[PDB]
Scaffold this active site. Sequence first.
Site, PDB file in Angstrom:
ATOM      1  N   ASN A 162      10.748  -9.453  30.104  1.00  0.00           N
ATOM      2  CA  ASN A 162      11.677  -9.216  31.039  1.00  0.00           C
ATOM      3  C   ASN A 162      11.551  -7.443  31.389  1.00  0.00           C
ATOM      4  OD1 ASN A 162      13.910  -9.747  32.874  1.00  0.00           O
ATOM      5  ND2 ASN A 162      15.206 -10.146  31.207  1.00  0.00           N
ATOM      6  N   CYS A 212      12.990  -7.429  40.739  1.00  0.00           N
ATOM      7  CA  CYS A 212      12.351  -8.276  39.929  1.00  0.00           C
ATOM      8  C   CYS A 212      11.008  -8.656  40.502  1.00  0.00           C
ATOM      9  CB  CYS A 212      13.146  -9.412  39.171  1.00  0.00           C
ATOM     10  SG  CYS A 212      13.315 -10.841  40.612  1.00  0.00           S
ATOM     11  N   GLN A 260      14.497  -2.184  35.675  1.00  0.00           N
ATOM     12  CA  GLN A 260      14.608  -2.384  37.069  1.00  0.00           C
ATOM     13  C   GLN A 260      15.725  -1.673  37.602  1.00  0.00           C
ATOM     14  OE1 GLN A 260      14.850  -6.872  37.250  1.00  0.00           O
ATOM     15  NE2 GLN A 260      15.924  -6.330  38.989  1.00  0.00           N
ATOM     16  N   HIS A 283      15.233 -15.080  39.190  1.00  0.00           N
ATOM     17  CA  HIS A 283      14.825 -14.041  38.388  1.00  0.00           C
ATOM     18  C   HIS A 283      13.504 -13.899  38.075  1.00  0.00           C
ATOM     19  CE1 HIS A 283      15.219 -10.370  35.943  1.00  0.00           C
ATOM     20  NE2 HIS A 283      14.914 -10.903  34.910  1.00  0.00           N
TER      21      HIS A 283
HETATM   22  C1  LIG Z   1      15.276 -10.683  41.225  1.00  0.00           C
HETATM   23  C2  LIG Z   1      15.835  -9.651  40.416  1.00  0.00           C
HETATM   24  O1  LIG Z   1      15.906  -8.279  40.576  1.00  0.00           O
HETATM   25  O2  LIG Z   1      16.477  -9.967  39.257  1.00  0.00           O
HETATM   26  C3  LIG Z   1      15.355 -10.569  42.520  1.00  0.00           C
HETATM   27  O3  LIG Z   1      16.705 -10.736  43.152  1.00  0.00           O
HETATM   28  C4  LIG Z   1      14.337 -11.397  43.309  1.00  0.00           C
HETATM   29  O4  LIG Z   1      13.232 -10.983  43.896  1.00  0.00           O
HETATM   30  N1  LIG Z   1      14.710 -12.808  43.160  1.00  0.00           N
HETATM   31  C5  LIG Z   1      13.821 -13.786  44.008  1.00  0.00           C
HETATM   32  C6  LIG Z   1      14.120 -15.152  43.159  1.00  0.00           C
HETATM   33  C7  LIG Z   1      12.838 -15.431  42.322  1.00  0.00           C
HETATM   34  C8  LIG Z   1      11.475 -15.138  42.966  1.00  0.00           C
HETATM   35  C9  LIG Z   1      12.894 -16.728  41.782  1.00  0.00           C
HETATM   36  C10 LIG Z   1      14.569 -14.042  45.315  1.00  0.00           C
HETATM   37  O5  LIG Z   1      15.936 -14.401  45.448  1.00  0.00           O
HETATM   38  N2  LIG Z   1      13.803 -13.822  46.209  1.00  0.00           N
HETATM   39  C11 LIG Z   1      14.157 -14.086  47.842  1.00  0.00           C
HETATM   40  C12 LIG Z   1      15.369 -14.161  48.229  1.00  0.00           C
HETATM   41  C13 LIG Z   1      16.058 -15.617  48.945  1.00  0.00           C
HETATM   42  C14 LIG Z   1      16.924 -15.505  49.930  1.00  0.00           C
HETATM   43  N3  LIG Z   1      17.798 -16.669  50.040  1.00  0.00           N
HETATM   44  C15 LIG Z   1      18.628 -16.962  51.090  1.00  0.00           C
HETATM   45  N4  LIG Z   1      19.537 -17.970  51.068  1.00  0.00           N
HETATM   46  N5  LIG Z   1      18.810 -16.065  52.147  1.00  0.00           N
END
Ligand SMILES: *[C@@H](C(=O)O)[C@H](O)C(=O)N[C@@H](CC(C)C)C(=O)NCCCCNC(N)=[NH2+]
Length: 216
Positions: free
Chosen positions: A179, A25, A19, A159
């Site tokens: 992963n 992710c 990625q 993640h």
């Molecule tokens: C994951 C990566 O590329 O490693 C990427 O950050 C991602 O999509 N993460 C998700 C979490 C998973 C689904 C558990 C994520 O963080 N999604 C939405 C962001 C939430 C925003 N939060 C606030 N407080 N603004």
Amino acid sequence: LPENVDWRKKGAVTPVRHQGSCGSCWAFSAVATVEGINKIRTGKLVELSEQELVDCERRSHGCKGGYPPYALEYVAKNGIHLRSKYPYKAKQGTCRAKQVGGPIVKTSGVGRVQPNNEGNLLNAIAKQPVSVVVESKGRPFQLYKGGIFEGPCGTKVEHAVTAVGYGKSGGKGYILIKNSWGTAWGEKGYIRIKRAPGNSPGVCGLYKSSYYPTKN
Ligand SMILES: *[C@@H](C(=O)O)[C@H](O)C(=O)N[C@@H](CC(C)C)C(=O)NCCCCNC(N)=[NH2+]
């Protein structure tokens, strides 16, 4: 239910990808589950586009993180193009879904597994690859080189990854995960995470939020 499951052996898993430095992710997890169910239904393993999702599915935030169920809804509604026709570039750009051609893979809906329960998750995995989440911020997880992972790790997930199997390794149960950090990390891109029994958020929060695509 089988003691061990591994979709890789059934030709339902494409090679591991990278990625890069784009919080994509969510798109990677979503694509891996659709490649798996398409193989299972049609008998053909085709590589799909994470970039289409990054550019076109906008309830999510492109390279700033997103949401697997939303990505899965986009595919059920619009279908998804080949990876060779719409390649990944580790940056969010203008949606070109309708400019790129080639065939499209479509699905029929998306299922939500009731979280925090081992059994619920195993039954979903026995069926096909599943989109799952995990806390990856800790050093133990980033430095993983092999074996059945136990943390140290909290359950504050951030993640998205893909469960492609599960099993038992001499006494310890685990869940096989694909992963998106390349083949130099973990077990050739994979990680076998310890299985928390019954009701539980899972080790590193693995049982917290799981989704899968359905296909006629
Ligand atoms: C994951 C990566 O590329 O490693 C990427 O950050 C991602 O999509 N993460 C998700 C979490 C998973 C689904 C558990 C994520 O963080 N999604 C939405 C962001 C939430 C925003 N939060 C606030 N407080 N603004």
